[PDB]
Every structure is written in structure tokens, then in C-alpha cells.
Assembly symmetry: C3
Homo-oligomer: 259 residues x 3
């Protein structure tokens, strides 16, 4: 996908790519080990057994759709390792997961969403996943367009995200009442990261260098790194503990859900 990165004299001072790459690479390395390591603990804990009491799994193995939290974190930790490699080489390298904004999210956010859809038994899974993929590609396109048609790609994703988010909130509110009081407490916090932090990504674009010019690319990277520590690892850990409490109630104690 690339045709031109770092110039031979280095980045020109005044470019959006003239950043502190040693600092950014350090932050990406911390994120890599944190997010990827959280996904590895998550995988380990899945295989340990069912709830908090670790009841042996029914088939002997973990359900396949219980792994999306772990996988999103393990894939994002790998993407952050690629990012540290680019930042430590000074930017603009042939394989850069830093260059195209939101491309890394095309591969990670569908998995975070699948985690919710499967854990909460949400209908219209295909419609929801397709929606999110469309939206993320509109963001990729908005960052790549050098004209005011970047606001057209931005608005097309908003036309896909506003319906998606309202439909999902409705569905998750319906499911919330089925859950036991202890699992509803964990879910509250997952819903505040999924529906409270997901809308911030679009607003940050509006204040960026491709918007009002308040947030530069270096600051945008730091903000997104912190947002990914919450929207990937904290989210996945909350979702793992929701499932452990769910299955401690439903599988280990055999009690029922409040339909």
C-alpha cells in the first residue's frame, strides 16, 4: 500500500511526521507487552476452566467464541510491536502500522465487537460487524484524503456508526436485564468503555491536524495508545471477568439467568 516514506535527509521540520520517534517507540513497546501479555493471560485463563472455580469445560476445550477478547489483545500487541519497529527506525518504513491511521483498527475492533456479540448473545452479528468495518475504512479514507472530501468520508462513517451504536445500545440494554446482579456490575463498566470511549475517536479527528489543528500527530498517537490500553486490555479483562461470573452462576452453580 505504500509509495513513499522517510526522505533521505530525514523528515522536514514542519511536517506532520517530524515527531519524537524514540519516545513514541518506547510507548509502543510498553503497549505491546501490556496488551499482548494481557491477551496471553486471557488465553491461559480461558483454558483453565469455566468460572472462578475453574470447572472443567464440557467438551474439554474452551468454546471458540470465548477467545475474541484474548485474540484482540494479542493481535493489537503484535501490531504495537510492528509500531515500535517503525518508530525506532524513524518512521515511514515500508511496513508501517503507523502511517495509515485506523488501519490497525480495521483488524482489531471487529474482534472486540465479536467478543460483545457472542458473550451477550446479541442478534444481527453480521450486520454489526459489517457496519464497523465500513466505518473504519471510511476513517482510513478520511485520513488519506488531502481535500475537504475527507469530511465526506468522515460523514459517511458517521452515517454507519450512529445507527450501529444506537442499535447496539438497545440490544445490550435488553440483555443487561437477563444477567445476575454481580454480572451486571461488571457489565456496567464494559458498557462505559464500549459506548463511552468508542465515540471519542470521531471527535479527536475533528480537533486534529486534519480538523482544527489542535492535536498534532505525536499527541494523537499518545492519546490513541492510552485509549487502546482501555479499549482493548481493560475492556477484555472486564469481559473475561464478566464471563467468569456468568459461568460461576450458570455453569458452576447451575442457577438460571433472569430471561
Amino acid at each position: 500500500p505504500f509509495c513513499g516514506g522517510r526522505p533521505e535527509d530525514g523528515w522536514h521540520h514542519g511536517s506532520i511526521h517530524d515527531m519524537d520517534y524514540p519516545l513514541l517507540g518506547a510507548m509502543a513497546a510498553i503497549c505491546s507487552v501490556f496488551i499482548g501479555g494481557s491477551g496471553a493471560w486471557m488465553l491461559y485463563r480461558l483454558d483453565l476452566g469455566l468460572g472462578y472455580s475453574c470447572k472443567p469445560h464440557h467438551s474439554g476445550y474452551a468454546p471458540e467464541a470465548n477467545s475474541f477478547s484474548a485474540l484482540s489483545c494479542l493481535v493489537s500487541g503484535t501490531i504495537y510491536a510492528a509500531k515500535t519497529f517503525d518508530f525506532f527506525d524513524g518512521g515511514g518504513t515500508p511496513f508501517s502500522f503507523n502511517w495509515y491511521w485506523y488501519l490497525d483498527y480495521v483488524f482489531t475492533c471487529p474482534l472486540i465487537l465479536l467478543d460483545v456479540l457472542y458473550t451477550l448473545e446479541i442478534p444481527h452479528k453480521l450486520r454489526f460487524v459489517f457496519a464497523v468495518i465500513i466505518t473504519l475504512w471510511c476513517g482510513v479514507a478520511a485520513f488519506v484524503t488531502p481535500s475537504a472530501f475527507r469530511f465526506g468520508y468522515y460523514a459517511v462513517g458517521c452515517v454507519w456508526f450512529v445507527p450501529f451504536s444506537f442499535s447496539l445500545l438497545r440490544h445490550v440494554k435488553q440483555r443487561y436485564q437477563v444477567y445476575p446482579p454481580k454480572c451486571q456490575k461488571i457489565l456496567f463498566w464494559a458498557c462505559t468503555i464500549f459506548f463511552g470511549f468508542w465515540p471519542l475517536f470521531p471527535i479527536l479527528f475533528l480537533f486534529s491536524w486534519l480538523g482544527t489543528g489542535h492535536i498534532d500527530q505525536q499527541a494523537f498517537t499518545i492519546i490513541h495508545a492510552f485509549l487502546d490500553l482501555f479499549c482493548k486490555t481493560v475492556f477484555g479483562l472486564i469481559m473475561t471477568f464478566f464471563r467468569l461470573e456468568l459461568e460461576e452462576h450458570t455453569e458452576v452453580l447451575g442457577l438460571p439467568l433472569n430471561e
Copy 2:
């Protein structure tokens, strides 16, 4: 995927890209609203209920594989919005869904096919989808190759499409007889768009600027826009009404299919 689009003085007169972009953008905008709006009505009508009498769905929600018609139309309307943005910027923009011919079809045509495969309960779904993806990438490659090896990529897709189409016609003829007389009437017309219009795409290449030079890129765009109004929206609407009649017979009236 891009390395060079519009020159700074504009397109050179005599290039394949020297077209009437204001007119093409207008046509793409009409297509966007028409195809995307048809996909939105389709989604609405899916959720309304089962047949023409709108019987409540069994699970409360629509079956997941009943949404492929709507999704193909909604995705193509979004791709046509991206196309209007490129045409209104004058062509050759970093994110151009106009530049690489048949790339938009790599993402939309598998969904049109899945709609048929699932609605008509066709076997070998993986083989058929894989086949179509291969073929479309051979077309992408044929448009990108500047030599006579473009006819080798073209012929490799023909080696994948001729078997696919004959195998699918056999399968759809077998399924046709299971359906009731009223649903067979709607299906006739779907089969004439799927098996009558799908083969025209390869013939148009042979008369294009990469073939005999009768059809330029501007005319090729207009032809494909009209073909997409029939192969996406008219097809999906016929497929929706086939399903409404099917389920009015089988679900609402509880009558059986003629095995």
C-alpha cells in the same frame, strides 16, 4: 495500493483518465442513494417480520443469512459514495474506488452470491464463493497489466467462471422445481440477472480500451453503473420478494415445498 494519481496540471488530453468527472460524480451520487437506500429498505423490511403478512420471526429476530441482499446494496451504495467523492475531486485521489476496476466487485459480488446460495439452499457454498473471489481478482489483475498478459489473467478467470456458472445453473435448476408456482415466477427474473447479466462483464472488457478500443473508460463507467443498478438493487429486491412469497407459503400458510 496507490503510487500515482492526478498530475498537477491535470490529466493530459488523450489519457484514459481525461473524462467528464462532474457528470460521472453526479451519476455515482444517484447510484449511491438508490442502491444504498434500497439496502436500507431491505433491512427495514427484513425486520418487519416473515412474509407479506409480516408474521413475527421465530427467534424474534431475522435469520442472519437473510441479510445479504441488503448488505450488498448498502455496501455498494457506500462504495458509490466514495466514487462520487473521487469523481468530484477530479479523479486519481489516494482512496479511489474508481481507479482499480473490479476491486469494488471483490467486496460486493460475493454477498450477492451468498444471498442466492443461502436463499436457494445451494450446496458447495465455499467452493462457489472462493471461485467468484478468484475470478474477480483475475479481472483486477487484467485491468492493471499493461501487456498482453492481461489476456492471460482474463483467461484464468474464465477458467474459473465458466465451471462456476455451469455448476450453479445446474444447482439452481434443481432448486427451481422445489418452489411454488408464484415463487418460481419471481425466481425466473432473478436468474436472468444472475446468469444473463453476469456474463456481460467479461464481454465488455473485450471491447474496452484494453481490448478492441470501442468502449472508453467514461462509457465503461456509465455501463457498469447501470449494470449495478440491476445486479445489485433490482436483483436484491427480486430476491426479497421471492423470500416474502416463500415464507408466506411456508411459514405463514404452513404449506410445503415440492421437494
Copy 3:
């Protein structure tokens, strides 16, 4: 994905791309017909019926996940046809499946793996497929990086492959004992190509022009062509005959597996 291929004066003598393209194209043509033709025989034989006695399939059609061997071979034969077209045009063509090393494997190796996972009824299918995709993209990135950070991408894939391969070996050893003596003999040989040849790909990188400089790009292509004749076609044929013997025991003779 491309921005620059063959120069107008041709490749410079001393480039990694100054190779014997007429010879390489001939080898790719042989591979195309061999691998693709093996996938076509495999498809034919799937549809013939169940075991060696060709018992009619239960649904009338072959199970969908019995086709991954055929599909991997048919897709690799098509990729090798694209490769012959590039080699016969002299290299560096816009659509080159030769340029980016291991990109062709991103599309073929997941299907070889799915064949094993489904045939041997292996758990954690998503985890295994995701793992392999990650690893192959790290290899794509290692071949594209011009610095010593190529060894960082290489090592990140090794961190994904070593766990994958050990976990799969454990799982396949568990499944091996369920199978009858005759099917265990065929499986031995499949396991020697899957677990004996798969690790050679990483070692070849270390001796390549991006490693110690013993293996040039021309020799690397020939080695990989031979490796693909074994890891695609020989593997798929062994897997087909394992399934025919399995189903001759379990379906045709109705005998049971040794749990």
C-alpha cells in the same frame, strides 16, 4: 500495493531481481498445472462419494469442510499462473505474486491448516488460524524491511509459530491414537510434511540475501516451488487418502474409531 517494478533499461546487473525469468516462468507453469490439476482431481474425487467404495454422500453432496485440500491446491495453482505471467514478462509487473515474499502464503496456508483442523477434528481452530495469519504477515514484513528490524518482525512471527506448532503437535498426537492402523500410516506422512517442512521456511530466510547471503532470490524461488509441490499437492493428496480410508472404515464399514 506497488510503486515500482522493472526499470526501463531492465534490471541492473547486481540487483536481487536480475534473474533467469524464462526459466522461472517455466517452473511456475509446471507448478501451476501440477498443483491446480491436483486440486481439480481432488474436487472430482470428493464429489464421487465417500470412501474408496464411493458410497453416496449423506446429504447428496460432500461436506463443506472436506474441500480445503482441493481449494488450497486450486488457489495455489492460480497464484502460480499469475507468477508465470510475471516471470514471462520479466519481473516487476503491477500485479506480481513474486514481488512480496510470503504474500501468496497468506492466502494458501490457512487453507492447508483448515484441512488438518477439520479432518482431525482439532480444537481452537480460530486461535490456530489467527496464529498462522499473524506469522505469515510478519514474514511479509521481514522481507519488505530494509533494516535489521526485519529480524524483529522475524522474531515476532517465531513467537507466534513456536507456540502454535507445539500446541498443534500435542493436539494431533492426541487425535492420532483415535485413528485406525491404516489411517495412522497415512497420517504419519502428513505429519512429516506439516511439522517437518513447515519449520524449514524460517531457516531458509536466515541463509537468504536478507540473512547470510548464501541463497539468492532465484534459488529461493526454486526451493519454494519444490516445497510447495510437497506442502500443497503431496500434502493434500495424503490428506485425501487419509479421509478415504477413514470413511471406508467409519462410513462404509461402519466400524468405530478408537476414541
